[PDB]
């Protein structure tokens, strides 16, 4: 339910983005 063209519900997507962004730093090394 995050697909609203970055409208409100994105933050719910966003902290996921902040999380996996940090985890997809990992998979570069690992």
The b/e string for 1-30 (b: 16+ C-beta within 10 A; e otherwise) is: eeeeeeeeeeeeeeeeeeeeeeeeeeeeee
Contact 2, 13 (CB under 8 A): yes
Dihedral over Cα of 8, 13, 16, 20: its sign? negative
Tokens of 29: 């090394």
Radius of gyration from C-alpha coordinates of the chain: 12
Q: How was this structure determined?
A: NMR
């Amino acid at each position: 339910m995050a697909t609203k063209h970055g409208k409100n519900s994105w933050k719910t997507l966003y902290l996921k983005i902040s999380f996996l962004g940090c985890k997809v730093v990992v998979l570069l090394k690992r």
